[PDB]
Amino acid sequence: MTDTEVAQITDNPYKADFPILAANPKVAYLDSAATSQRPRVVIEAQSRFYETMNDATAAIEDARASIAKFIGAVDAKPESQQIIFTRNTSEALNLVASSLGRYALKPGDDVVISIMEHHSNIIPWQQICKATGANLVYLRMNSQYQITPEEIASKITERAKIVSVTHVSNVLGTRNDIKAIAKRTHAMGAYMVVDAAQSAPHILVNVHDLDCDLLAFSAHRMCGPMGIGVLWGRAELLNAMPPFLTGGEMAPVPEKFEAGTQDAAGIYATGAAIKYLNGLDMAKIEKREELLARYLVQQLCTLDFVDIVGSKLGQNHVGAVAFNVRGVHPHDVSSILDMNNVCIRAGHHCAEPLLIELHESSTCRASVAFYNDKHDIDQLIEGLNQVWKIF
Amino acid sequence: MTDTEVAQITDNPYKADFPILAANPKVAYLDSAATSQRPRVVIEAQSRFYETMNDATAAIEDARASIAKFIGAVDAKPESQQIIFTRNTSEALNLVASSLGRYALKPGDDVVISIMEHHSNIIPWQQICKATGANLVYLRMNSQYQITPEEIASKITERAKIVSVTHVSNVLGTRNDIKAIAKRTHAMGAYMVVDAAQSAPHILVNVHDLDCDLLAFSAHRMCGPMGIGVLWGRAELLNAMPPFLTGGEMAPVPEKFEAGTQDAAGIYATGAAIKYLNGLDMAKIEKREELLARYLVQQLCTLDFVDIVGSKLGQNHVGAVAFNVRGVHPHDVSSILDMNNVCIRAGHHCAEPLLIELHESSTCRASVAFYNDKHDIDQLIEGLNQVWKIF
Numbered sequence: 110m111t112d113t114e115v116a117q118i119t120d121n122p123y124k125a126d127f128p129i130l131a132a133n134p135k136v137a138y139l140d141s142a143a144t145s146q147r148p149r150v151v152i153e154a155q156s157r158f159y160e161t162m163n164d165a166t167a168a169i170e171d172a173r174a175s176i177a178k179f180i181g182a183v184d185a186k187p188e189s190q191q192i193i194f195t196r197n198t199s200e201a202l203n204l205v206a207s208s209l210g211r212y213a214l215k216p217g218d219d220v221v222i223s224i225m226e227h228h229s230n231i232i233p234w235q236q237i238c239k240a241t242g243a244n245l246v247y248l249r250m251n252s253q254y255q256i257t258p259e260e261i262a263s264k265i266t267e268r269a270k271i272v273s274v275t276h277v278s279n280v281l282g283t284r285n286d287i288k289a290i291a292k293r294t295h296a297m298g299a300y301m302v303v304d305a306a307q308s309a310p311h312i313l314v315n316v317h318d319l320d321c322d323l324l325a326f327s328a329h330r331m332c333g334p335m336g337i338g339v340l341w342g343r344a345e346l347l348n349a350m351p352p353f354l355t356g357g358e359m360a361p362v363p364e365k366f367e368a369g370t371q372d373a374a375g376i377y378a379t380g381a382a383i384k385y386l387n388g389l390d391m392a393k394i395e396k397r398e399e400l401l402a403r404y405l406v407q408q409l410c411t412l413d414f415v416d417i418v419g420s421k422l423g424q425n426h427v428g429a430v431a432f433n434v435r436g437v438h439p440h441d442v443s444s445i446l447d448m449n450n451v452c453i454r455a456g457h458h459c460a461e462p463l464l465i466e467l468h469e470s471s472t473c474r475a476s477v478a479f480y481n482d483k484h485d486i487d488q489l490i491e492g493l494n495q496v497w498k499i500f
Numbered sequence: 501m502t503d504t505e506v507a508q509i510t511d512n513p514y515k516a517d518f519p520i521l522a523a524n525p526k527v528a529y530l531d532s533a534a535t536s537q538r539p540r541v542v543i544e545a546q547s548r549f550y551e552t553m554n555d556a557t558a559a560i561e562d563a564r565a566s567i568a569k570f571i572g573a574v575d576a577k578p579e580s581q582q583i584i585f586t587r588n589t590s591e592a593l594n595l596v597a598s599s600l601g602r603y604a605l606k607p608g609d610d611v612v613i614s615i616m617e618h619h620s621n622i623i624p625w626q627q628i629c630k631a632t633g634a635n636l637v638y639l640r641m642n643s644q645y646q647i648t649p650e651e652i653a654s655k656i657t658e659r660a661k662i663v664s665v666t667h668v669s670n671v672l673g674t675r676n677d678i679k680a681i682a683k684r685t686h687a688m689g690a691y692m693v694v695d696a697a698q699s700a701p702h703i704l705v706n707v708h709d710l711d712c713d714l715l716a717f718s719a720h721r722m723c724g725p726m727g728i729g730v731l732w733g734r735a736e737l738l739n740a741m742p743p744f745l746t747g748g749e750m751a752p753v754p755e756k757f758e759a760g761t762q763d764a765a766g767i768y769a770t771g772a773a774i775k776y777l778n779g780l781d782m783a784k785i786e787k788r789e790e791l792l793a794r795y796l797v798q799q800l801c802t803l804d805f806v807d808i809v810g811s812k813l814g815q816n817h818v819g820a821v822a823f824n825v826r827g828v829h830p831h832d833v834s835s836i837l838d839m840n841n842v843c844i845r846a847g848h849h850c851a852e853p854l855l856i857e858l859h860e861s862s863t864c865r866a867s868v869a870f871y872n873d874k875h876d877i878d879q880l881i882e883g884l885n886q887v888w889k890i891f
């Protein structure tokens with residue numbers, strides 16, 4: 110890293126835009142992989158909705174539009190009638206597993222997930238597979254923590270019908286080669302689902318580059334409100350899949366997939382959040398996070414009592430870094446770190462299969478967002494040192 | 501009605517507490533059966549959440565607690581580990597139909613809904629019935645628009661396994677005799693589901709009086725945020741039913757039924773809304789709404805060109821009054837009424853089976869909340885008269 114990149118990490122042009130951070134300069138918040146903080150604009154936008162609207166229809170679709178363009182889902186018109194609102198990524202994944210699974214799995218077909226999956230991209234597929242007569246096949250990692258072109262070609266075969274792989278691991282921070290896996294999957298007559306809850310808020314997503322069929326994520330990782338998950342699909346498939354939830358207001362896509370009154374004020378704020386990110390220049394966002402990502406792991410590697418659970422190179426870490434203090438249970442680490450005003454995730458991160466694979470029970474995790482600065486990463490370091498001195 | 505009851509309807513001690521109404525004295529809002537307006541307290545409470553918390557765990561359960569006590573779900577402790585959050589009433593009903601339906605329907609069992617049902621209490625049961633080998637039986641109405649003790653005993657028999665009936669009709673305004681239907685249903689070895697989305701915000705609900713097994717509703721009819729539906733269940737059944745959505749964070753009840761990150765800021769505001777209603781004195785609430793209910797229908801009956809689609813007695817109308825101007829399509833009525841700054845629902849209200857039963861295609865609907873006054877009901881009347889003069 111250059112001396113002028115530590116300069117960029119050292120300045121924080123963004124933290125003022127967050128009330129909770131603005132109110133707490135003493136706090137280092139290092140869990141954005143869990144949920145983001147909210148910009149003031151997004152908090153007010155949603156309060157606004159409830160206080161003036163409760164036209165509103167014009168604004169839901171402008172939100173659909175804003176999200177669609179943000180994920181590259183264009184035509185030159187944003188494909189807003191092809192994005193659906195759920196509660197969060199888990200629900201969109203449950204929906205895919207139910208609807209796509211009924212429409213597509215014949216008995217003895219193969220559904221393929223990765224060992225890197227979060228539980229929400231595992232259990233629904235297990236059910237789908239029991240209900241349907243289908244087998245669940247996993248893609249495994251190499252020494253350097255990758256899904257290699259050999260694993261892809263060898264585990265996605267002609268028996269494959271659905272392939273559902275995380276874009277970015279909430280534990281390792283690995284960016285998976287989603288377009289590669291897409292192309293072998295189509296070859297084998299199979300549908301590409303991408304869990305992108307942890308890629309969408311950090312790197313750029315373009316569904317038409319990724320050439321996938323279903324993409325899901327949540328809004329609360331990209332600065333949006335809780336309560337909002339989004340799914341996108343190829344129109345033809347959205348028209349073809351059965352509906353999942355049924356009732357009133359469930360018809361055409363998207364309405365076919367949105368039963369009941371929806372969180373309009375939250376869909377509205379989800380728009381404000383997309384509009385807030387594109388204003389920051391989304392490229393400058395991805396750039397800052399990589400400098401914060403690289404600075405953290407470099408710093409973590411000066412600490413010998415610490416084991417980074419993943420690639421020791423930080424060019425490879427998108428958003429999230431998993432680690433262990435040698436001999437200290439992560440719950441103990443997070444406690445002393447909270448006494449030092451630092452926020453890290455501790456445990457298995459609802460990715461237990463991955464952690465078994467790497468022969469771990471628990472890990473700490475630190476995760477970076479654009480509204481963090483070098484001092485944030487220095488607090489965790491100086492707090493981790495307090496930890497060692499005690500243990 | 502006494503001259504001192506028109507006095508109570510004439511004063512409005514509540515409208516100031518709503519920013520959207522406060523900002524629009526010219527507007528008469530008569531669609532609270534669709535969604536309520538939000539109190540300022542509830543708007544700020546949710547903004548608050550995002551700006552200070554994003555302990556938070558202490559507050560989700562205080563919300564669970566507040567809701568539980570509000571529906572009488574006590575022990576003397578509130579049964580908060582027995583209420584579950586969904587997105588809205590439709591999802592809770594979909595969940596029941598899936599989980600309870602898998603756990604309980606053997607082929608040739610009978611599931612019984614009412615003809616008064618909203619679609620969200622119909623279609624999931626239709627699916628459940630096709631998947632399971634079970635028959636869907638409907639409870640029908642008499643001349644006076646009731647589910648009589650003969651209909652109950654004759655359509656809920658030993659073949660019955662699930663009975664799911666609306667507590668209050670979003671079209672007729674009828675309060676159904678839920679405890680009666682509960683008691684015949686148990687007799688026949690069957691589970692009592694109550695769709696109470698339209699009863700919970702107006703009359704008192706006590707799950708232990710109603711002696712039911714599942715109750716659902718939404719928060720946005722009782723002044724809470726959109727995005728929040730609640731389900732309650734008898735603990736033993738909640739422990740026994742399969743989980744519906746699966747993934748991460750889905751285990752014990754309630755967590756077994758809440759997959760993924762949840763709308764904590766919205767669950768928080770849902771608490772603020774319950775806490776706002778009990779402060780108003782919930783009894784004084786039910787009382788004011790009946791005076792507004794009685795005044796509307798009495799007034800509507802002076803208008804001859806108008807047909808009230810339901811009981812002409814307004815002691816019987818909870819919350820909602822359906823009607824038609826003779827010869828005018830409701831969409832036309834709502835348009836001229838919107839030019840007169842009045843808000844009514846027009847159409848079939850996602851209760852099409854009911855409307856077929858009553859030989860109607862569309863109806864207008866007016867619905868009253870505690871924050872309405874006699875002038876609100878006088879605007880609709882004087883606007884309906886404009887309608888006739890033109891048609």
Ligand SMILES: Cc1ncc(COP(=O)(O)O)c(CNCC(=O)O)c1O
Pocket residue numbers: 142143144197198199200227229230275277278279280304305306307326327338454458459748759760761
């Ligand atoms: C890769 C990935 N996929 C799906 C989900 C589920 O998202 P929802 O909560 O919105 O349903 C998560 C959550 N990741 C949780 C964490 O690492 O903190 C995830 O990291």
Ligand SMILES: Cc1ncc(COP(=O)(O)O)c(CNCC(=O)O)c1O
Pocket residue numbers: 357368369370533534535588589590591618620621666668669670671695696697698717718729845849850
């Ligand atoms: C009796 C009843 N049950 C269930 C629902 C579905 O509720 P959700 O939107 O929260 O999912 C409704 C909605 N009633 C809509 C209306 O009359 O305007 C209802 O009136």
